[model samples]
Structure formats: structure tokens, C-alpha cells
Target: HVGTFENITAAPADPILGLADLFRADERPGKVDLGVGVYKDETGKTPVMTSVKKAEQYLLENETTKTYLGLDGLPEFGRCTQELLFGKGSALINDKRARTAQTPGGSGALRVAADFLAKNTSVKRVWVSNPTWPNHKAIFNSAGLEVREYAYYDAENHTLDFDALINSLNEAQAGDVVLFHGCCHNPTGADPTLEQWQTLAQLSVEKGWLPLIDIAYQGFGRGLEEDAEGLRAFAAMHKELIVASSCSKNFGLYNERVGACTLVAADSETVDRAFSQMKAAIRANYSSPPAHGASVVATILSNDALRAIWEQELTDMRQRIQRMRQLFVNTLQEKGANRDFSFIIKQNGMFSFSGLTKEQVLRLREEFGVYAVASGRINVAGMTPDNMAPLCEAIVAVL
Candidate 1:
């Protein structure tokens, strides 16, 4: 050992998060940062929902309990999340085939599941969609699990390569975890249609593989119900299923990091065991989840008035994102980009892959104050009406 006893090396930063840091460091007032996944309003600010604010105010005034929720965390939070993701009175909910535990966030939920898979299964590899969120692979890898990729986006057409994805899933072994982005897929912003989801569900049943769904962007994509259609149908099929849900995007609770992990086993015993194991892991990891953000969500869901307000607030956020999409696509076409980017308008949620090559991305960043992920992944939510024109101009120039 050296006299000073130095044995550490600096690790490379996270790709997307690293870009966001660079964006933050840039001092130009007119600079446009179309990187990262979180949604921003027309003013380019990530605003907390009105309902969430009201819930917080109510809890701050009326809340009395500071008691722990134990390893299972908050039961009411689980019930509310289950109802939100899968409609009220779901057959899956009634059958006692599923169990849930409140998690620190979606990432926490996934981590818990990953730990379980590492211990319980012989399968070493989990297949993730190509061009999925950066953290999906990182999270799995941290648990000593291998992440395999299936073809997803075809940049030439700016659309899903359905055939390739289906073929890849067909090759998965039994007990393997197949991670699915529930809606508004990160980076690519491409999602499978209802028919595709149905086909995939049937494939899971036939192939005997476990479907581990990461439903992070529920309201950001389609409406709440529409976004959850895939998960609902998958849950109803009664196949072995796991869902890691997040309120970070939909409820604007990013920093608070409230989420839940749920499992639907084929039988009651299996579900109970899985639930117990997940809870034990949670207890060992964080002891218990946080209360403030989750309390806000619970308050909103329990009160009819706040629930109504939340629905409208969610709807408004969705509609505004769609509006930005419309404006960006139309403006791009009108300005003679000589390309059909209309697909961008049709895609839901905050990101669009844009099919730009690495070189084009470099040019965009170097020539203009426009910053995007090097993979050509741009956060559509980052585009304000004021920034849209310059962003499109940069895209046109870069191409």
C-alpha cells in the first residue's frame, strides 16, 4: 500500500444525469436543455400539482400520527396505488393472488424485486427494452443481475420494431424477468399499442416467463386509465406478475419519492411469501418509507374533493404536453425539415428519440445552445413555446 493509503478510483457519471448536470452548469439564459425525463410546464418549470399542494396543506394542519408503518409500510398507500393502477374492484385485487408494499420510490421497488430475483431464481439475466431508461440497466446491474437488450426502436422509421421485440421475448427462459416500461417509455417515448400488449401478455403465459413491469409514467403518457390498460390486462391474466409503480411523474412527487411494489402470484401462498420477503428486504434496507409525500397522496385519494382536483390537474398536464408535441411537429414540418416528424406528435409523454445520429447530436450541442442526450434522446417536456422555435431550428441545422 502507498504511504498515503489511497485505493479509490473515481467512477464515471450516469449518462443522462450527467448531461442534466452539464445543462445545469451552463450559464446561458437562452440555452435549451432537452435532456432528462421529468416533465416541465410551458414556463420550463417542474410545477407541483395543485392537488398535491392542497393535500400537503391539509396534512400539515390535521395530521396527528408519527407512528411507523412497519415493514409493509402503509397499507392504505398500497390499496390506493392498486386501485389507481388497476381500477377499483379489479378481479385481480379480489382474488387474493396479489400483495403489495409501499416503497421509497419506483427505484426502491425495482431494487427490492432485483434482490429477490437474485436470491430466489436461477435465471441470471433480465431482458430490457432497447433504449429504455438509463437507470433500468444500472439498477439491475447493481444487484449483480445481467441486463439483456431486445430490439425496440427503429430510428429510420422512428417507431417500434415489434417483430424483433416479440422474437426476443419468445427466447426468454422460464423464471427470467422481462422488464416492461408501463407507458411513455423513457428516451424513446415509443409505446406498444393495446393489441401489442395483448399479444405480449399471451406470450408471457405461453413462455412461462415472469413479467416485471416498471410503471413509472402513468399520467404522463395517456390518461391515467389508458396508461394503466396494459398493466390491468396483464394482471387480470393471472400469470405470475410483478409491478413496480411510481408517483414521481404523475403526482409530481419526484423528490419525495413515493411508490409501491406489487406481486401477483398464481396462488395465495406464493403471493404471501413473496410479499413477506419483499417486506423483509425493505425493513433491512430503509427500515420504513417516508411519510410526507405519501401522506399527501393518501389525503388526496381519501378525500373526494382533492381526488377530483388531482384528476383535473393530471389531465391538464397531459394535455399541455400533447399541445407542445403538436406545436413542435407542426413547426418543424412548416420550416421545411424535409422529414416527417409527425410521429413525434402521435407519441405520448415527455421524450422523443428523434432518430438523430451521434454526430448530429454533437453538432446540435456545439453549434447551438441546445443540449440533448448523445443518443438523440430529447425530453419533449423540456420544450417551452419560447424554446420550441430555437430547438426546431437547431434540429434542422444539425440534420
Candidate 2:
């Protein structure tokens, strides 16, 4: 393996995005695609939020310069992010122990935290849920940390194996970083209840481990403030915490690459010190985040009237995702699918562990032109009225 030779081969296709491509290539009429990750409306369009458009219009008239910003990007974005992460009245805010930095996306936010952990802390390991976005593993591994998985799902029963989860992490040592989906635990969709979250926070303090939360689907799960219940518990108890928040789903700024990484330390002074290390990590990664997305978020969150507009917009999207879930479950039973599929509704977020066999998934595509990941993971974010009944019909046929 010398410089003259080439050893890199084609990497395997991304399970999620790759599946979307396959759906596009298929030409069957009434073809169903449950593989996409972004939220869709009843009209099957990923329409930009009205709040975002208004924010953009405001920026168009007021933005002054195209100059580069500091490594931390927009102060307004960070302030809003901190407020959003830890509530506005939170002591976590008044005490000044948290530092927020803008990032390219949820992925970038996680990577920046990973880089910081790799270089600035004694942390050398990260623990993720067993069925988390595998990219979770890739990001941390790239920074030379040992990535491990703990129990998360109960595939046979379609629920979170919470006790099994704690048992698995029982061996995790102090100074380790535990990855958590702040709300709407991705593919599986099942999440810990608020009480469970408090227990987890207690464990974190007793065990001396850090909680690194990925808040990609914040408002997509519950109400904006409600979704941060678990994260708030962590901040209230733990001495240190890490957060990577995404605006892709809630703000509909998917292409805009808007997200933030927040690091919390034991004290305000240490948090001040950690900000520089976090800034250094970001400086080496992308130097600075893009200007436009943060501008859009800052603009919306800063104005009370505009913020209300965005919250209503978010509520509209959240309601639709909820409606689609109940609709699908009821439709499948109404259609009298071979199996009772009601286990899906108890789940949250953009996806649910469908538990469909690979054979069933293959037949759903080949026989009915329906698409889902072979792992039986289907994104509820793409569920729409147009595809709902027909999609249930296809799934019924396959079963």
C-alpha cells in the first residue's frame, strides 16, 4: 500500500439517502416511498415554513455585510440556541455555564463535539443506542474515540428495552460520553418518558459520565418546550453535558445547514475556558459556519411576533406528523392487514421500527412498488394523505 497504488473502493451506499435514490429510479404508478427522512405535507411537498420565508425577506432588506464571522458564528444564533436548549428562565442561562457554537448541520455539530472531546478532554469512548443512526458511530470514530453501543430497542415487541439499556451501560466508566437523542429517538422512534429521563440523569451523576444529546427532532416529537424535558433534567443535575441541535426538521432549513453545538461545564469560569477549546475544534473543522441559516434562525427567534409565527408553523408540522401516525395505524387495522400493526403509533419522530422482514420489504417493492429500508425502518416524516391509504394497502398486500 504505497502512494502509487489505490486501495479505496466504493463505499457502501448510505442506508437512508441511498434508499431514497432507489425510490426515485422506480417508475411504477402510485409508487410509495416511505424511505425519505424530511417531513412532507398532505400535498407531498417539503414546503418551506412561512416563518423562514419572512425571516429571509427581512434579512434581504437589512443585512449589511458579507464579511466573515468569528469561529463561533452569530451571537444571536448562540443565544437563541442556548435559550432553546436550556429554557430562557433556566439557571443554566443566568449562571453562564453553557457555551454554544453554530455548526453546518446536526452532523457537523456532533463532529465538532467529537473533535473537542478527542482533543480537550480525558474522554476516549462514546456510547450510543444500539439502533442509532450508524453515522453516530462514524462521526465519533473519525475523531479517534472508541465508539460503542448500548441496548435501546426491543425488536420483537416494538418498544424501548429501558431496563436492558441501563444494564448494558452498567459497565460504562466515568468520563465516558453517552450519546442520547434528546427527543424522538430516530429510527426506532420509541423514547424514554420524562420520569425515565430523570432516572438516566441520576445515573449520569452517580456514574460520573457525560450526556451528549442530539436534538435533531426537537419540536417534531412534542411541543418545543416539552421536547426538551429530558435535556433539561440533564442540565439540572449533571455537571457537564453536550448538545448538538438541528434546525433541519423543525425550521425546514434542511439545505441551509443550520445547527448548533453547546457544551456545559461544572462552573461558569470553566465553561468560559471550554469555549475556546470548542472554538479551536470548530476553527480546524470548517473555520466558521455558513452565514445564511443562522441568520434565518436568529431573525425568527429574536422577534416576538416572528417567533409566534414560527411556533405556529412548527405546531402545524408537528400536528401533521402526529395525525399521519394515527391515520396509518388506524388505516392498517381498517384495511385488515394480515398483522396488527398498531405497535407503530406509540412511537414518535420521523420514523418507526416497522419490524417488516427483508423478504416482506423486498416484496413490497417488487410486487407493489412500495419502498422501505431492509432493516424495516420506515420514516413517518414522508407519510402523507395521498400515500397513506395506498401505502397501507400495499403493506397489507405484502403481509
Candidate 3:
């Protein structure tokens, strides 16, 4: 190993993750971590979902053997993911054109999908929304895939740049991969309307392009079923699609590494071929995914009672995040700040691009002990009732 590392150099820590490491070391009381994007509950803690806990308890009681799932991964987990993502009665599922693979998490799914696309197609470029999840580009590039940019967040107006995005996507060529966030878009927290999504789907058909979707925070911004709108639309219209879904946010399974990648082809033959290629990619890479998370999710989704409990808990979390956004804006206005922080209320999901500069972000952390990403993105879910007053006060001082 040292022979292979003869010319290797030490790498810098990831910005956000490094910040978390520093934050943990500080031992400062009431420290806020808006840099990390994971959803936190009312107590300022990331709690495991009750349904997941119940599922795990049931699994422990059942006492099953630890058999290895094939490189293709768990079939039951994949099936449950398919029904959740593509809608229970989707033609994509019924026609046998859709195939699913259990992944380590959304990251694994993205890596596997990017590898398949880059190796199987001639296209050199894949388009990601401007100011997307920072990991997206890193993952694609690591897979030897070229990354292109398309319009997404509009800082001037603080809303979705649907028109510019349409023009950019319309220019994509056949076989080019177009990445879209299924719901609760990261960093910006802005998403297109139903009409814009319709046009996006139609453009895929007209341009003969491929759609690669990432659904990381499905139940954070809106309701669970409601957040599946874009995915369902793609499943109905496009014969070819890649949905990389994660349970890290909604299901509170961050440590479990629960996620699935679903591919919908035009027909059974195409699905079979796609599955073979996907399995080859996975086998050559990780060999097989872990079983605990997938089995836990499968047990929960398969049972009606657990599913209902998850929906209720998920909705409660969504409502609390909304409350925090409103409170933040209201506090800004109450302090008579010149800038309108009202854009935050309109933005949905865990994070928001607060338009604060790198200096301001550092100032907030250094002076006020309130930490956020350098890009000015703040996690709304990180705000708690106890911390809300101080958080708002800190923002006011910085602004």
C-alpha cells in the first residue's frame, strides 16, 4: 500500500464535515450547527423515527440468519422503494421496465448510476443544478463523469429560475444525463412548480435525454406523497429514468445507510439489460450493500401500521421546519433589519441560501458561536425553540 502511495499527498478535510469536527471539539454550550444538513427534531436532536425503532425491535425479536444478499442487493427492499418512488400503480413498475438496487445510501446510488451512465454512453457531460449539493459534482467526477451546470437558484429575486433552467435543459443532447432533485432541493431549497416540471419532462422526451433524480429529503419540505410529484411524472412519461433515493432524512436512518436506486426502461428487455449492467457495476465496486438498514425499511414499509406512524411523524417534522422559517423571518423584521428575510418562508426544506457572504458566515461563527456553511446556506431544521431567540439575535447582529 505504501508503494502505491509513494507520490500521494494528504488531502484537506471536507469543509462542512470539518466544521462539524471543530464544532464538536469546542464544547461550547448552545452551539448551533447549520452547516450540517441533517434534520433535527424539536429538542435540537436528530431522533430515530418511531416506526424505524419499532421495525428494528421486531427484527431483533424475529431472529433471522445473516445470509448474504447478492450483488444485485435485496429484492424486497428494492420493491418497496419502487412502490414508494414511482407510485404504487405506476406503469413503469407494472410493465416490468423498472429495476431497483439497494445502495449504501444516496451517495452509493449516485456513484453507481454515474458509473453506469459514464461507461455505457458516449456523452461526456451531465448537467447539475447550479448551486446543488456539493457532493453531487464530487461523486460524478470521481466516477469519471463530466459535470455541466444549469440555472437553478436566483439570488437576485430569491426564487426558482424556471425560464433560464428551461432554456438550458432544452439545449441538452440525447443520452446526456440531466440531474434533478425530486423534492426539498439542497442549498437553495427552491423547486419548480407543477407546470415547470411538466415542461421539464416533455423536454426529456423531445431532446431524447436521460433523467437522473436524487430524492434525499422527500418528507422534509412537503408531505411524503406530495413530494413524489416529480418522480411520478417522470415515471409516467419518460421510459428511461434513474431515481436515487435516500432514507437518511425522512426515515431518520442516516447511520443506517439506507437508500435505493431505481431505473425505469421502456420494456422488460431493456430492464433486464439495465439490471445486468447495474449489477456488474455494483459487483465490481462494493460487491454488496449492508442488510440492516434495507431490512428495517422493508419491514416498516410493508406493514400498514408502521407506514401510517412514519407518515405522521414525518408530517410533524415538516411542520416544525416551517415554523422555524417563519420565526426566523419574523424575528428579522421585528429587529427592524433593512433586508427582507421573508424569502426564507417561501423556500422549503432543511437548508436556505441566506445570501450572506463568506466573511459574514465566519463572523457569525467566530463572534456569535452560530455556525453555518460558508456558502451562506443555513439549515432551518437545526433551529430549536430554546435556540431560536439567540439564533435570530445572532443573525440580526451579523446583518
Candidate 4:
């Protein structure tokens, strides 16, 4: 008989990376690859931030040894990340109701949080947005949690399916966990308004649902503080909530993998217990996270000068994405496309759900080498002035 291992079949290709691979292999001189979810500049390059460079230089000059950061890695990085997420003088921080643990990346933080929840809480089901980040369900499912979807995006109208979302949440059980995009929701890029956030918070409290916020792109949507309004609102009302945030995008430390998982509990005791549990999860999973990324983040955040530079760089990136969004809408109009492409301008963050059908997406890939997700989600940051016209033309042709 054949070995049992031989029965394992090849898995389906990853949609994003598969497209990226095809894009790379395409010899077209003007091929536009908008499949991967990374920030790029006007020149079509992922430039390292000046703040990160300076922080590395500082570490090179001052650091003495290359040592391991046990279990939870750097405490300074956690503290600084907490302050950045929950405000410097937040009541939660001052009252000792909040704690953070360094993780490998935003994805690592999500998986850690899911595992922690699975082991600690009674929650067995997690509710995610209908069109959420592709990895959200996979990470939660890996932790033995049942993943459910709540209606979020309306494909036909190109708007938030607010009524469907409310109905779905109303039906969720008390102990079920509801996962939220802290800001700048992935794929769809449609975020809730302040009033909607308040409603969600109120509903969570009344229904006894625990909220888990994944904030991968914090400063990419609005300004930092502005993007945090929904998260702060939830933290204000809930005694226990989870936040998994990443510095990869804002700090341009993609390869460095800097992220944090934070728990806001009722008191110091709960915070202490949660921290211990998180450390255990870290130890069992990867032993310990690397120190360099967190060190770089901590160094920049702890220093006023470096923090200012980082903030400025982040603002520049945000503005550039916004500019690209507008330019995409304007260019589509200029091409006299019969379809209304104005929805691109309304969506936030580095992505826009282009409302292109799967067939159109295939045509885009085959004919013009314009690679995007089958769902028609394109990285707005992928657009540059040089390729914008070609991309728009391809889009119009597909339509």
C-alpha cells in the first residue's frame, strides 16, 4: 500500500501570491501588479522610512550584544505600542486595565489572541465581517474557533450593508466573539461612521459579546488619532476587549514584522493574568519573538524627535494613498467609462473594491497584465502617476 503521506494532495494556490507570481512572471514592460497588500510610493517602490534608518543606526552604535528577548520580548515595545494605540494618558493605561505583548507580526498577534481566547474564555464562535481580511478567518479557525460572517459590504451598491450587519449582530450569542477592523477595513476599505461605532459598542455591551479589533493599518486611513476613534470608543465601554495592531505599514517595517496584542481587562489582576497567559502562548508557539523589529519601534516611539519624523512619514504615506484614490476616480471619469467609479474615492486606506466582476478581473489579468484580486480589490498605493492612465484604460476596457 502507498504511504499515508502520499495521499496528501497539493493545496489550492494562495489567491494573492498566485496573482503576484503571475504578475512577476509577466514580461510586459508596463504590467501593473496590484495584488499584494503592501504600501508603495509614487515611484513604485517600498522605500524605507528615515525614522527606521535612524533607529537602526542608533541601535548599531549603542547596542552591545545580540541577545534573546524571553517569552513576551521587549516590555518597552509593548508599553510604547499601548500608549500609541490607547493614547499616552488613557484612563485604561493609567488605571492598569490594559496590557500588551509583543508578537511576530500582526498575523502572529491575531493568532496569539485567538489561541489565548480559545484557552481562556468560553467563546467558541468568532464573528468576522463578510468581506474581511482573507487571513482573519484562517487564523481564528486554526485556534479551533468556529468562524461566522456578518454582512459588511454591499457589492451591488458599493456601500456598507448596515442593516444586514445590525441584523447579524443581533442574532449572535452573548459569549460569541465579534472581530472588527479597528480602522481602514481590509479588502472593502469601508469603515463605520462614529455613530455606527457607538451603536456597535452599545450592542456589544448589551449582548455580552467580546470585541476583537484588528488594526493593521492604523495611520493609513485618517490621521492616527482619527483612525483610533472607534477603538477608543470600544475600550471606553468594555472592560474586556482585544486589540491586535501592526507597525509594519505605518513604520515601513514590513520585513521586520513589528506588532502587538493587547488586552483591556477590568483591573490589574486580570491584566496580570492575561499577560501571563499571553506569555505562555508565545512560549508554546514560537518560543519568543525577535527583538530587532520591536527594538526599532521602541526606539523611535520613545524618542520625541524620532517619533515626530515617523509621524510625518506616516502622514505623507496616508496623503499619497488618498491622492491616488482621487486620481483613480478622476482618471476613470476621464476615460468616459459608462460605470460610476466614484465609490473608489469614498473608500479609505490602501485598498478599493473596484466593483469589477471576476470575469472582468480575468480579462484584466489576461489582456493587460493588470493583476488584482478576483474580488476586484486593488491596492490604491500600487497606483503611480506613470501607470495610472494605462491602468484606467485597462479598467475601462474590461468594463
Candidate 5:
């Protein structure tokens, strides 16, 4: 007898990747794709850094077999990554109150963190920014934890709504989880000031809540150490916190999927306990993460000469993005558009919430072959000499 079984159905496509697919299929000679979120050079190419290339050569010349890196990953990679994020003399690291585990990427780090909390702690809900990375909600919800949003981006003003955020946080109960973007808030590109971070740190202490920090674009918004100032302040005031660090952006290892998940606790006992729980979580999900990316990162960070080279390359990338942002705004001004595109300059990193209406966004694609989201979010790094003038003209047409 033959039997037919069917229980699965088609799922909705990912909004970002789906748009990327459509952009790839278009054959227009001068079409511009600002929908995807990745860095591209002025020549519209994503080049591998010299430091990464050197590290790969070193690894190939000296490394041995293709063995598993275990549940916790390379010890050297974890230690190097921890120091990179928390600094070498951090009290949490010096006192052995903090730990690190390598993960596939920032997304994997977040997933491991969510699973660890759900399985080990009584916390059942996580509070995230209203306009956070679209994946944040999906990741936490998939782990069986309730996800709620607090006011963050003020669409009308195109800025951070700190007062509304504080008011919303005041309603959260004790033991709740609060997630913060360590730097370069995705999509909206608005981050809190140092004063605001300090205030939130004090509030976490008073409310007995845990802070989860996601640092994906460390050097994109500012200097590497400067970007981590907020996270350092949080660690100084609060004993219990979680940080997920990504190497995809700064190190240009997007496909390699290299990242670290770190947890800071009050005491050595809690730190050790959390380490074991994190290991178990990794075992259940991926068993072992790949070694190539982490090895490359560890190699560059550990060697002083390579580290300097990497920092210089990272600074070049940051300056390029900033320059592109200014150039974009200037072009709009030159076009004599009767609108304020100043917010484009204010936004940092790879994105700018352009505030274009949904209808306008649709027309941008239909008439001009310019692709962006309905929410008006475009990858600023996507701008290039070839497309800048045309893109600005397209925006004016839509307006």
C-alpha cells in the first residue's frame, strides 16, 4: 500500500532577504539596491580586509586537523573576545565573575542567551526597544519567552524618545529581562546618551532587573572602545548582565558567523553555574560551532601588529560610511528639495529611517528601480558614486 503524507505548508519569506532576492533578479542597467543590510565600498564591492587575509594564511600554514572546538569553543578566542569587549582590567573578568562562550553569530548568541535564561531562571518575559532589529522579537518568542516593546524611536521627530522609554520601563516587574543595543541601534540608528545609560543602570539595580546587551556594530558608530562605554557602565553598576558581541561587521566575517556570548554575575559560584548552563544550551542546539572564523579573530586580536592593522581598517570603514552619509544629505540639498533631509546626517552606522511613506516607497521601486523598505529604512552603506545622484533624484520624485 502507498501512503501520502503532507503536514507542512509554505512559510512567509523574510522581509529583508526577500527584498534582496527581488533586487538580485532585476536586470535594470542602473538599478540601485538599498534594501539589504551589509557594508559595500565606494566602488560597490565588499572587500576582505588585509588583516583577515593575513590571519587566514597564518592559520593555514600552522594549523593541524579539522577537529571540533567543543561546546564552549576555543579558550583563546573566548579570552581574547572577553578582553576586547570588557577591557583587559575589567573587575568582572579580574575577579572571575564573568565568562564567555563562542557562538555562530550575534543571532546565535542571542538565541543561546534566551534559551539559557528560560531554562535556568524564573524570568519569562523580555523587554526590547519598540523598533529594534526585526529578529529580536522572533528569537525571544521562539524560546518560549514573552516579548514586549518599550518606546524607543520617535518617528515624528526622528530621534530617541527617552521619556517614553523610561515611563514604559517603570511598569516592568522585578526579575524581568531588559535588552539594550550596546551601540548603533539597528534600523533607526538612534542610541541613548551616557547619562541615559547611567540612569537605566541605576533603575536596573533598584528594580532588580537583568540587562541583556546586544553589540553588533561596535566600531561603526564610533571608536571601538568608545562604543562600549555604555556596556562598561552597566557592568560597573550591575552585577548580573548578558552581552552578545558580533564580529560580522567590524571584522567583516559575515558569512563566517563569528561572535561571542558573555555573562556577568555577582559571584564566582553564579558565574560557574551559568557557564555550565550555557554549555548545555550550545550542546542541545548546534553541538559545536565552526572554528575557522573564531581562529581568524583570535589570531588578529592576539597579535599586536595584526591588531593595529585591523583597527586601522575598521576606522577606514567607519569614516567611509560617515562620509557617504554626509554626501547623501548634501546631494539632496543641491537638488533644492523643499524638505528636511537633515535626519539622514544625524543617523549613524549603516541605516537611516528615511521617513518615506509606504506609497512613496512602492513608487520608488515601481517607477525608479530604487528598492527600500515600506518603513523607509535604507542601508546607507549601499550608497555609491554610481547611484547617489540617481537615488537622491528618485527620492525627490517620490516626495
Candidate 6:
């Protein structure tokens, strides 16, 4: 028995997740972690929202049973999610062309969508931003779908290479899937403008490729409605669209693993057909989503008082990250950094491609206790008043 399994090797650690190994081993009190994807408050900890706590309290009092919530999870959660993502009175919601299924998290939603597309459609290839989340390639690979790359971030200049992206995507014809970071593009925070998003949405319609917009950091970039506006453009122009959204960043629900996969079709009938297929995939994959987290989100979004608390808290988090970005850049400037770093504030989300090379990254870790990914993608939210000076000094010294 041991001999047969000996041929197999253990799965390699994720590039981003693997950094924690080196980070945790060193217990330097001044250690600053820019590695993991989680958002950190000024206190350098990810806090649960006040609204989540209130909702959890309400659920403890009101929830009736622990029974299964069927394939799509709670109707309350699913409907609330649909309204939040596509907008309450949008045609997709009112005309009944949208269907949503709650899953474990954004990753779960992506895997579910991957399997659904793999088994149900003629889509053989899935195109992603060249410097997209590494897991995008792995998850699509799991479904036996071909993974293709399109130009996205300008690594040399640290910005979105819009022209290269457009020309590359132009090669994608019908019978393909393109995954876009709806807002707050990961790894590199650079993202397309609203006008650019609308143009790409129109391109999806003309090209006949299914657009799957990943909505991970919805409220982390701009406002909630403003962030969703880009994805909503696809909803308006395309006959078919797929959305994978998460509450991990916005609601601080990482451990809760709450997320959803929503589909928009031409009509209610087609929506139902797509819903059935997606459910079938979920049935085989996870069977059902965890009820507690989704219920918490549903409670917050559905109740007026709770919704207000959530909006305010979400806004606070957004402002904090923006402040951190500004502070990081300002501190760097004060440090007499060798290069211009104003791009840090220009890019949105919790990440900034700080442009630190591999050797510099290791040097910062060993010498200054500053830990970030080798690719130079640092969590801008991780920088705080306490860590700002040291982090900038390390970067400046390395430069």
C-alpha cells in the first residue's frame, strides 16, 4: 500500500501562502508582513465587522433549524446577494434573468463555475489576465480547460497595459471564457477605468465570449455601488455573463468562507436552465454551502438597521486602506526613495505592486524583518503608522 502511494508527491505550497512559513519563523517584534491577501486594520489585525456581530446575534436568536438549504443555499441569502451585485431594480433582477448560488467563497464560486463551463458548454479555453491570481490557472486546470493569457499589467511601469490587453483579448473569439477582476485587481492593484470597462463589456458582446467577472474586493476599492458598476456594464450589454463574488474583504468574512456564483441570461427560461446546470455542478462538488456565514451576510443586507451599520463600517475600511496607501507613499517620499511611487495611491484595492525584485525582497526580510511576496506585490493595507517608517526605510535602503 505504501509503495503504490509513494510515487505521488505532496502538493507544493502556494507562492503567496508559502511566504507565511518564512514570516512566522522569525519572531522579530517589528516584523511587517505584506505577504498574505487578507486586509489589516491600523492595529495590524483583521477585525470582524460590527454588523457581522449583530447579525450573528440575531441569527442565534431567530434561526429555526440546522437542516440543509438545498443546492442554492438560503433563498434569503441568494436573493440578497443577487440584488447587491446586479442592483435591486436592475433589469437583470426585475426581468428575472439572474440566478445566484451561494458557495464557500470566491474560490469555491470559481471552481463551481469552472466545472459548470467544462461540463455544460463548448468552451474549451479560459483566458485570464497574464498576471492574475495564480489560483486562476490551477482551478481552470482542474476542470481540464485550456488556460490562455492576455496582456494585463504593465510590469515595467507598474500600471494597466490597456492597449496590449485589448489587442490580446481581440484574439479571443466565440466559444471562450474571459476572467476579469471586476474591481481591485489582485497582486497588482492597477485596474481599468469605468469607460474602459464599458468598452470591454461591449467587446464581450461582439466577440461572443462569456465574461466571468470576479468580484472579490467589491467594496475595498471604491464604494460598493461604484465597484459593481464595472461588472454591471457587462450585465447590461451581454446576453450571458457570470459573476463570482465574495464577502471576505468587505464583510471581513474570510474564515466564514462566504461567496456566490451568479449567472445572467437572455430570459428567465434560460436563466433557469443555467441555474439547473450550476446546481448540478455544486451538487457534485460541495453538495451545499455552509449556512452560518451566508445567513450573517443576508441578515445584514436585508435588515435596514444592519445594512446601515455595514455600509458605514465598509466605508471606514475603504478609507483606512486609502489612507494607508497615501501614508506609505508620503513616507517613501520622505525617505528619499530613489524612484517615484505615487502609483501606489493611483492603484486601488489592498495590494500594490511595489516593484521590489526577488533579491530585494529577501534582503528586506532578512535585514529589516519586512516580508512581502517576491513578485513585489505588497499588501498596502498591511502598512500602518507603526510599520510605515521602517518599511519605507527598508525599501529605500534596498533601492
- TM-score, per-candidate, Cα-based: 0.95, 0.97, 0.96, 0.97, 0.97, 0.97
CA lDDT scores, all candidates in order: 0.83, 0.89, 0.86, 0.89, 0.89, 0.89
On lDDT, the stronger of 3 and 6 is: 6
Give the per-residue lDDT of model 3 (tens digit) for 1-399.
469878988898678778888888877686888887788888878888899999999999995798888976778899988888877777777889888889999999999998887777675778999988888998999888889999887887898988888887766778888999998888888987777778888888888888999999887877777888987777678878899999878889898898988888889998889888988989889979988999888898899999899889999999999999998888778876779888899877888998888998998888878899888889988887788888878888887
Each candidate structure's count of clashing pairs: 0, 0, 0, 0, 0, 0
* Model 2: CA > 4 A from native: 1-5, 15-18
Candidate 3, residue 350: how far the Cα is off, in Å = 0.7
> Candidate 6: where are CA atoms >4 Å away?
1-3, 15-18
**Candidate 6 residues 1-399, lDDT tens each?**
368887899887676666788787888988999886888888888888999999999999998889988988988888988887888779778888888899999999999999999999999999999788878998999999999999998888887989899999988979799999989998788888989999998888888999999999988888888889889898889888899999888999998999999988899999899889999999998899998899999999988999999999989888988999999889999999999998888888898788889999999999999998888888888888888998898899999
The sequence of per-residue lDDT tens digits that candidate 4 reaches over residues 1-399 is 879899899988777777777887899897898876889998889998999999999999999998877777799998988887898779999999987888989999999999998898888999999888888888999999999999998888889988889997887899899999988988888999988999999999999999999998889888889899899989989999999999888898988888989988899998899889887888889978878999999999999999999999999999999999999889999997888888888888998788889999999989998988888888989999889999999999988
Which stretches in model 1 have alpha-carbon errors above 4 Å? 1-5, 15-18
Where's the lowest-lDDT run of ten residues in candidate 4? Answer: 13-22
State each model's C-alpha RMSD to the native: 1.9, 1.5, 1.6, 1.3, 1.5, 1.2
As for TM-score, the candidate ahead, 3 or 4, is: 4
| Error at 233, model 2, angstroms | 0.5
Ten consecutive residues with minimal summed lDDT in candidate 2? 1-10
